[PDB]
Amino acid sequence: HWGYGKHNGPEHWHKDFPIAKGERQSPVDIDTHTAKYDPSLKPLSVSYDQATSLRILNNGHAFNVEFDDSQDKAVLKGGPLDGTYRLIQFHFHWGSLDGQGSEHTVDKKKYAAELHLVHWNTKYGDFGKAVQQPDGLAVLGIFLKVGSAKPGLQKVVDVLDSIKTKGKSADFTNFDPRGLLPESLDYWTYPGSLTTPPLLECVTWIVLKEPISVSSEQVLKFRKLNFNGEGEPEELMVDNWRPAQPLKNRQIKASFK
Numbered sequence: 001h002w003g004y005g006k007h008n009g010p011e012h013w014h015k016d017f018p019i020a021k022g023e024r025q026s027p028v029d030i031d032t033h034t035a036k037y038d039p040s041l042k043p044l045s046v047s048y049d050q051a052t053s054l055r056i057l058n059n060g061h062a063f064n065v066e067f068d069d070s071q072d073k074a075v076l077k078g079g080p081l082d083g084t085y086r087l088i089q090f091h092f093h094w095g096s097l098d099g100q101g102s103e104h105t106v107d108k109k110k111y112a113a114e115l116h117l118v119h120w121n122t123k124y125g126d127f128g129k130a131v132q133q134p135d136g137l138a139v140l141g142i143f144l145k146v147g148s149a150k151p152g153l154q155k156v157v158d159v160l161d162s163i164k165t166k167g168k169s170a171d172f173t174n175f176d177p178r179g180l181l182p183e184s185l186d187y188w189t190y191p192g193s194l195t196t197p198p199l200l201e202c203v204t205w206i207v208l209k210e211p212i213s214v215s216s217e218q219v220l221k222f223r224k225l226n227f228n229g230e231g232e233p234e235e236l237m238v239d240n241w242r243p244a245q246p247l248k249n250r251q252i253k254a255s256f257k
């Protein structure tokens, strides 16, 4: 099916997922000079103290650290959000080289990778119902640059060898996502979509301005993963990012002056 290769990559997705050419697609380039500070934005609240991680899975597109979202444990509120959004999973998008990998870009700058913490609006009951709503999801995006190692990320890095191929999963309990956040919560926000098929336009994007630093060694291990399943020709899981899409009259708002 769809992927990131030359024959099934982003430029081909529209054939099976027409919304790919929609009016609210993600990611987008964030032109910092055009983004406007929005006084109406309420304080952003990231409450991950009771987060319950459960498993890590290689789904053939990236790897997901899944959480128990049967209760209001890890939640995201405030900012441009109305109500409570529950953390369900987080994953990354990265490149084959340090100069690329992020999905959103800042003044056209591409980061080495991008972390996506996915949350769904609790007023819709479940994730399935949420992806049928214009405000069903909220994804917190964090940029990764290559520099000093990120202590909180190492546990994720060290388990990757156990889920090298598509379909493989491993227990991943007691992981604290707070160790992946930068110091500042300054952010840019705009209405968008999922960046991979089905590309549904149900996401309120909140992209943090401050990137986190990860070591070359850490990202190199991300690049050892496989898109393929076990026993198949090895296709390194790299460059699993979608390029910037047309803004289409949308406005990106800044939480800071």
Ligand SMILES: NS(=O)(=O)c1ccc(CCNC(=S)Nc2ccc(-c3c4ccc(=O)cc-4oc4cc(O)ccc34)c(C(=O)O)c2)cc1
Residues within 6 Å of the ligand: 116, 118, 126, 127, 128, 129, 131, 139, 193, 194, 195, 196, 197, 198
């Ligand atoms: N990069 S990004 O933008 O951050 C991003 C990209 C992709 C995705 C996820 C893409 N895949 C989707 S959407 N998967 C999906 C959607 C709905 C359901 C779903 C479906 C679907 C059809 C239906 O008829 C009833 C469903 O009921 C459901 C009840 C639930 O409690 C949770 C999910 C769920 C399920 C599933 O079955 O696990 C998976 C997340 C973030």
Ligand SMILES: [Zn+2]
Residues within 6 Å of the ligand: 091, 092, 093, 116, 195
């Ligand atoms: Zn993503």
